[PDB]
Amino acid sequence: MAFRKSNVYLSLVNSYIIDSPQPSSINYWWNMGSLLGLCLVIQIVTGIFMAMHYSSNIELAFSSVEHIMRDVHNGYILRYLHANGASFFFMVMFMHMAKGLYYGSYRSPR
Amino acid sequence: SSLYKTFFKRNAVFVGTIFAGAFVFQTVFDTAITSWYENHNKGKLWKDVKARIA
Amino acid sequence: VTLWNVGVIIFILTIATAFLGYCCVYGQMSHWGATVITNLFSAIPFVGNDIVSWLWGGFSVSNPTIQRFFALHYLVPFIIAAMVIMHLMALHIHGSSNPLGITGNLDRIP
Amino acid sequence: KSTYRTPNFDDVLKENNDADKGRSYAYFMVGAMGLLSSAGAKSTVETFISSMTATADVLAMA
Amino acid sequence: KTGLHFGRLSLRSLTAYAPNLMLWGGASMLGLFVFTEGWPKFQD
Amino acid sequence: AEVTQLSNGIVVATEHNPSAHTASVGVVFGSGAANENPYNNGVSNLWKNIFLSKENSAVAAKEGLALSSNISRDFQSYIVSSLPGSTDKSLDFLNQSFIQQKANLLSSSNFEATKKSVLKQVQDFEENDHPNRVLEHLHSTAFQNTPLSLPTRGTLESLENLVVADLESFANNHFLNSNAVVVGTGNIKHEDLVNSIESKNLSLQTGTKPVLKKKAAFLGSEVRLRDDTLPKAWISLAVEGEPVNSPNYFVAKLAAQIFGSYNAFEPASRLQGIKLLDNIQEYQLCDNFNHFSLSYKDSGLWGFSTATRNVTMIDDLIHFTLKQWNRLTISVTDTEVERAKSLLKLQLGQLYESGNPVNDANLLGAEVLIKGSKLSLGEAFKKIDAITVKDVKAWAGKRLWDQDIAIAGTGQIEGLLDYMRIRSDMSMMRW
Amino acid sequence: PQSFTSIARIGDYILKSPVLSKLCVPVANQFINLAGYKKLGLKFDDLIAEENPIMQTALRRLPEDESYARAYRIIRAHQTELTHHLLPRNEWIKAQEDVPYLLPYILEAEAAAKEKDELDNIEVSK
Amino acid sequence: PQSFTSIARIGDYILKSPVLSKLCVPVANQFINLAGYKKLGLKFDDLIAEENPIMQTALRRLPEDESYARAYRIIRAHQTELTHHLLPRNEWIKAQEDVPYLLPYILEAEAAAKEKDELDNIEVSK
Numbered sequence A: 001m002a003f004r005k006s007n008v009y010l011s012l013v014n015s016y017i018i019d020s021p022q023p024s025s026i027n028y029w030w031n032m033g034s035l036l037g038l039c040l041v042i043q044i045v046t047g048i049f050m051a052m053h054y055s056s057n058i059e060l061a062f063s064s065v066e067h068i069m070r071d072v073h074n075g076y077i078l079r080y081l082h083a084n085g086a087s088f089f090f091m092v093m094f095m096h097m098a099k100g101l102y103y104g105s106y107r108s109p110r
Numbered sequence B: 001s002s003l004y005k006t007f008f009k010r011n012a013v014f015v016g017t018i019f020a021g022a023f024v025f026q027t028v029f030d031t032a033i034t035s036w037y038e039n040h041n042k043g044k045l046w047k048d049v050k051a052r053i054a
Numbered sequence C: 001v002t003l004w005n006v007g008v009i010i011f012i013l014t015i016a017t018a019f020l021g022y023c024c025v026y027g028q029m030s031h032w033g034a035t036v037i038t039n040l041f042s043a044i045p046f047v048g049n050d051i052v053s054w055l056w057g058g059f060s061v062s063n064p065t066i067q068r069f070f071a072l073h074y075l076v077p078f079i080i081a082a083m084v085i086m087h088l089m090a091l092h093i094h095g096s097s098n099p100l101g102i103t104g105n106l107d108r109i110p
Numbered sequence D: 001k002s003t004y005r006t007p008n009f010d011d012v013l014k015e016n017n018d019a020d021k022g023r024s025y026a027y028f029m030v031g032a033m034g035l036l037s038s039a040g041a042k043s044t045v046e047t048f049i050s051s052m053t054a055t056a057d058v059l060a061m062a
Numbered sequence E: 001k002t003g004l005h006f007g008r009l010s011l012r013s014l015t016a017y018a019p020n021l022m023l024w025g026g027a028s029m030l031g032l033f034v035f036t037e038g039w040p041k042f043q044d
Numbered sequence F: 001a002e003v004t005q006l007s008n009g010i011v012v013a014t015e016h017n018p019s020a021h022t023a024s025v026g027v028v029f030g031s032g033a034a035n036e037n038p039y040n041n042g043v044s045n046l047w048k049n050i051f052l053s054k055e056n057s058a059v060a061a062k063e064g065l066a067l068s069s070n071i072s073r074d075f076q077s078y079i080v081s082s083l084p085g086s087t088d089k090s091l092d093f094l095n096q097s098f099i100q101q102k103a104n105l106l107s108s109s110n111f112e113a114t115k116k117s118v119l120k121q122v123q124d125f126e127e128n129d130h131p132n133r134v135l136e137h138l139h140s141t142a143f144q145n146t147p148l149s150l151p152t153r154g155t156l157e158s159l160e161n162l163v164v165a166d167l168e169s170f171a172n173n174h175f176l177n178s179n180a181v182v183v184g185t186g187n188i189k190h191e192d193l194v195n196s197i198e199s200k201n202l203s204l205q206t207g208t209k210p211v212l213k214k215k216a217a218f219l220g221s222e223v224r225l226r227d228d229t230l231p232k233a234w235i236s237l238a239v240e241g242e243p244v245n246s247p248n249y250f251v252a253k254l255a256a257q258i259f260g261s262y263n264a265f266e267p268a269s270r271l272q273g274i275k276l277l278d279n280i281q282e283y284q285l286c287d288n289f290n291h292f293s294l295s296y297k298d299s300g301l302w303g304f305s306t307a308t309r310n311v312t313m314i315d316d317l318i319h320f321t322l323k324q325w326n327r328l329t330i331s332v333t334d335t336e337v338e339r340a341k342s343l344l345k346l347q348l349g350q351l352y353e354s355g356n357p358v359n360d361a362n363l364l365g366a367e368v369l370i371k372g373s374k375l376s377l378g379e380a381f382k383k384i385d386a387i388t389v390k391d392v393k394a395w396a397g398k399r400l401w402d403q404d405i406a407i408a409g410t411g412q413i414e415g416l417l418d419y420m421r422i423r424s425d426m427s428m429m430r431w
Numbered sequence G, H: 001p002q003s004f005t006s007i008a009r010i011g012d013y014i015l016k017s018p019v020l021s022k023l024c025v026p027v028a029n030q031f032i033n034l035a036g037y038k039k040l041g042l043k044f045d046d047l048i049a050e051e052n053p054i055m056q057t058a059l060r061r062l063p064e065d066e067s068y069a070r071a072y073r074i075i076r077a078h079q080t081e082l083t084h085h086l087l088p089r090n091e092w093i094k095a096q097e098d099v100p101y102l103l104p105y106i107l108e109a110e111a112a113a114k115e116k117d118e119l120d121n122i123e124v125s126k
Ligand SMILES: CCCCCCCCCCC(=O)OC[C@H](COP(=O)(O)OC[C@H](O)COP(=O)(O)OC[C@@H](COC(=O)CC)OC(=O)CCC)OC(=O)CCCCCCCC
Pocket: A027, A028, A029, A088, A091, A092, H084
C-alpha cells in the first residue's frame, strides 16, 4: 500500500482529510465546521504575539493595550484582528448550531 | 501549447516559477499601489505642506 | 526507531522550557545566564546581528526580554503534552521490549 | 435500452477537442492561484515577525 | 559492474535524479527567496 | 516464405509453403463492423452464421471441405479449407451459393432458425463472459457517437429488428469487387491459383462502397456497471494509440511488452523482470493483468486490463500501475528496452509463423487490403532492433504524459474512485 | 546489523588459520560462559532478533519439531527472570547442545535476496 | 420517535369516523404535496430513518425486487439535488404509486419486540 496509509502519523491525515467518504449532496452549510477551525487558529496565534507586550496589573493593564496600539510595530493589526475575530468566531458558531437544529443532526446515532 | 515545460509542466517549475514570481510581483505591486495612493491624496501629505512653508 | 526520534524532540523542548522559566525570577543568576546564552547566536555567519536583536527586543537583556520569556514559558509545556500523545501512539503499535531482548508474544498479562 | 448506447453529451461538449486548449487554460489559473498565495502567505509571516523587533520608544532612547 | 546500490537507490534512477535537483534546490534556494525578503537576508 | 500479389483486376495474394499438409482458399472483404449504423448492427454476424448453417455445411462435408469465418472491425472473411490435391473443388464451393446463386441460402425457414441461434449466443455472452464484455464497453465509451464503437456481435434489440431485406441491402453495398481480396495459404502454388481463377471469368460488378460520413475520435469518459452479486471485479483502462501504417507502430508494441502480462497462480509468471510485480505481490492486489496495443486504420488503444478479488484495495492497484507508466517518460532504463526487444520478436514470431493455414489467411488478407503488400518477418525484425531509449521517451511524452483516459468496469467496483482522482495520476509531479 | 554472510566470511578465515585460531578461540570460549545465556536454558540462536523479513523467512522454514521446542525454551526463560533465580544445574544447556540450528536457513535466505537485488540493478548493453 | 403501532392506532380511529375524516383528510392531502418528496422521485417509506434495530429487521425481510428498486430511487434523488433541479414531470411519483410497502414488515417486527419484552418482566406467583 501507499506510504500515506502505512505510516502511524500520515494515516490519520489520510483517514480524515484525504480519503474520507462524504455524501455527494451536501451544500455550503456543511462548510461552517472547517471555518471554525481557522477561527481558533487566528485567535491563538494573534493572542500569543500580544501576550509578549501585556501587563496584567490593574494600574498597568489599560496603558499596556495602548502601548500595543501606538508603539509595537504592526501592533494595531494584531489587536484589531483579535477583537474583530472573536465576533466572527461567534457568528459562524451560531450558524453551525442552527444547521444541525435544522437538518436533524442531533438524533441517533449522533 | 508547445510551451509547457517553459511554463508549468515540471514539478520544480510548477513551484519553481510561482516562487520565482512571488518576489518580482512583491515589489512591483507594492510600488504601483503606493504611487496611486499619493496622487489621489495630492496636496494633503507632509511632503506638500513642507514645500509650502519654504 | 520512530519512538526514539520523538523522544529526542521532547528532550530539547524540556531544556528550552527550564531555561525560559529560570529567567522569569530575574535574580542575579537569571540575568547573566540569559546574557551568555543569547550572545552565542551573534556568531552565526552572515546572519548574526538579527537573531540576537530579535531575541532581545532591543540592545541587551532588558524589559522586552523578560515579558516575552514568560509568554513562551506558558506555551511550550502544552507542545510537550502533544508530543507525549504522539509518543504513546508509536508505542501502542509495537509494545514494549523486555530485559531478555527477544520476542514477548508467548507470555503476556494484562 | 442497451448499455452500449451512451446518452448525449453534446449539450456540454465542445465541437473541437484541441488537447492544448484544455491543458493551457487549466494550468494558468491553478498556477496563478498558487503564485498569489506564495506572496500572500509570505507577507503575513513577516508582519508577525516584525512585531518582535524594537518598539518606537526603545529606539528613541538609543 | 551492474549498477552499485547499497540498498535500492542505484545508478538506474540517479541518472534521472542528477538533473532533478537542478530546480529542486533551485526552488529551495527560491523557496527561502520567497520567505526572506522584507526581514534582512541578502545573498552571495 | 515469400508473398506474391498479382492483380488481373482481382487481387490474389498467396504465400506458398511446401512443407504443409493442408491448404486454405477464401475471400476477405474490406468492410467490417465499423461500416454499419446503429440499426443494422451485428448484421455481419448473421452473414458469418448462415455461411456456417447446417444445410450449407452439409454440402461441403461431402467433398472433405471445412468452413470457417470471422467478423471483426475493418474486415470479414469466409474461408474454405481442404487437402492440397483438392483446391479446385474449393473454388467451386465459393462460386456457387455464395457468389453466384446466393438466393437459396436466404430462405424463410433457414433465416428464422439462424436468428434465434444468434439471439442466444449474444445473450449468453452478456451474462457469462465478463473480461470480454468489459473490453467491449471500453470501445463503446471511448469512441461514442462514431463508427468505431459498435459491438461486433450486435445488441439484443438491434438483432431482433433485423429482417431478410437487410442482408441483401448489406451485401449489395459491401461485397463488391474492389472491396475484396482472394487469399490462399498452405501447400498451394501461386500460379495454379491464378490460372484456375481465370480458367473461367470469375468477377463481380460495381465497386465504390459508401464513404463513411464521420471519422474516428477519442473521448475521455467512463462507464460503470456495478453488480454486487458477482464475486470479482474486472477493469480496463486505456489512452489513444498508434494506428496501422503509423511511424510509431512498433514503438507502441515495445512499450506494452515492458509491462507485459501476469498470472498469480502460475509460479514461473511470478519471477518475471517487471518492476510493477514488486508492489503487486506484497499484498496480492490482483489475480491477472495484461497490457495491449490495438491498432486500426483510424486510431489505436494502448492500455491494460485486470481482474481482482481484493475488492477493498482496488485504488492501490490503479495507483501503482499508473505510477509505472510515468517512468517511460522520465526514467526508463536500458536493460528494460533490451528485454522487451527479445520478447517482442518471440511474440510476433508465434503469431505469424504458427501451423494453422486458416490463421494465416486472415492475417494475409488484412495487410493487402490496407497496404497493398505484405511486410516480411525479416524486415519487421530489422525495425525492432533499431529502437532506442530516446524513441520510447519521445513517444511516451507525446502519448501518455498528462492525457485523457477511458475506463470501464463491472462487478464489485465500489472501491473504484471517480475520474479526477485517477486522471491526476498521469503525471508524476516529480519531474 | 552486520549480515550473517559477512560474519561467516570473517569467522571462517580465523578457523582455517593455525596462528589465528591459537589466539582467538580461547578468548571466544570465555566470552560465551561470561554471557550466561546457557544458565537460563537458552541456545544462542534463540537470542537473535526476529523483526526483519530475512529472519521471518527462516522461522517458517524450520521443521515443526524444532519449532515447538524453541517456544518452550523461551517461555521457561521468561518465568525464570521474574523470580530472579537461575535454573538448576541439571537443566543448563551443555556445550554440545548449543548448535547453530538456524544458520543454514538464514544463509540461504540471504543468498537469494542478494541475487534478486543484483538482477534488478543491471547494465547489460548490446 | 413515537412508534408505528401508536401512529396507526390514532390514524385508524380517524378513518372509521364519519365526521373526523370529513375534516382531517382534506388537510392531510395538502400536507403531502406541500412536502414535495414526489417531485424528487420518492415514496414516503424511502424517507424513514433506518438506524435502529427494528428498521434494520424490516429491510432484510424485504423481497429483493423491491430492494433493488428502492436503491435506485435514493441514488436518483441525491444526483437531483446537487444540480439544484427537479425531475421532469414524466418521472414524478403519482398518487397511486405511493403505497405503504414497508408498513407490514414494520408492524410485525414491533409486535414481536413488545411480546418478548413483556415476557422478560413477569410477576407470576403460585
Ligand atoms: C460572516 C462570515 C463570512 C463567511 C460566511 C460564508 C457564507 C455563509 C453563508 C451560509 C451558506 O453557506 O448558505 C449557502 C446557501 C445554500 O448554498 P447552496 O449550496 O444551496 O448554493 C450553491 C449554489 O449552487 C452556487 O454554488 P456554486 O457552484 O456556483 O459556487 C460558487 C459560489 C460560491 O459562493 C458561495 O456560495 C459562498 C456562500 O459563487 C458563485 O455563486 C459565483 C457567482 C458568479 O445559500 C443560501 O441559501 C442563501 C441564503 C443567504 C445566507 C445568509 C446567511 C445569513 C447570515
